[PDB]
Amino acid sequence: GCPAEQRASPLTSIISAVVGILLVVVLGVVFGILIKRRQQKIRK
Amino acid sequence: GCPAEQRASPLTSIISAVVGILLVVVLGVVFGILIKRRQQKIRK
């Protein structure tokens, strides 16, 4: 219930967004191929 | 034999830069803490 809690430029918002998304994709993909490449674990 | 034949805006360059760096940091950090947290490899 406390919106507009940012004191930085309007760009800082976009930056934080990309980072979060990227990071997720980074591991998601990196692990997706890496893991799917080894396949040395009980597959669900 | 003529790669990098893109004439996209000057911003496209910055985007590609951040991505590369971020990705590296993502795994580097994510693995740094995760691995350093488990420490289940090559025991001294």
UniProtKB/Swiss-Prot annotation, chains A, B:
Region (Required for interaction with KPNB1 and EEA1): 36-44
Post-translational modification: Autophosphorylated. Autophosphorylation occurs in trans, i.e. one subunit of the dimeric receptor phosphorylates tyrosine residues on the other subunit. Ligand-binding increases phosphorylation on tyrosine residues. Dephosphorylated by PTPN12.
Recorded consequence of changing I15V: In allele B2 and allele B3
Disease: Glioma: Gliomas are benign or malignant central nervous system neoplasms derived from glial cells. They comprise astrocytomas and glioblastoma multiforme that are derived from astrocytes, oligodendrogliomas derived from oligodendrocytes and ependymomas derived from ependymocytes. Ovarian cancer: The term ovarian cancer defines malignancies originating from ovarian tissue. Although many histologic types of ovarian tumors have been described, epithelial ovarian carcinoma is the most common form. Ovarian cancers are often asymptomatic and the recognized signs and symptoms, even of late-stage disease, are vague. Consequently, most patients are diagnosed with advanced disease.
Family label: Belongs to the protein kinase superfamily. Tyr protein kinase family. EGF receptor subfamily.
Subunit annotation: Homodimer. Heterodimer with EGFR, ERBB3 and ERBB4. Part of a complex with EGFR and either PIK3C2A or PIK3C2B. Interacts with PLXNB1. Interacts with MUC1; the interaction is enhanced by heregulin (HRG). Interacts with KPNB1, RANBP2, EEA1, CRM1 and CLTC. Interacts with PTK6. Interacts with RPA194 and ACTB. Interacts with PRKCABP, SRC and MYOC.
Job description of the protein: Protein tyrosine kinase that is part of several cell surface receptor complexes, but that apparently needs a coreceptor for ligand binding. Essential component of a neuregulin-receptor complex, although neuregulins do not interact with it alone. GP30 is a potential ligand for this receptor. Regulates outgrowth and stabilization of peripheral microtubules (MTs). Upon ERBB2 activation, the MEMO1-RHOA-DIAPH1 signaling pathway elicits the phosphorylation and thus the inhibition of GSK3B at cell membrane. In the nucleus is involved in transcriptional regulation. Associates with the 5'-TCAAATTC-3' sequence in the PTGS2/COX-2 promoter and activates its transcription. Implicated in transcriptional activation of CDKN1A; the function involves STAT3 and SRC. Involved in the transcription of rRNA genes by RNA Pol I and enhances protein synthesis and cell growth.
Protein's recorded name: Receptor tyrosine-protein kinase erbB-2
Organism: Homo sapiens (Human)
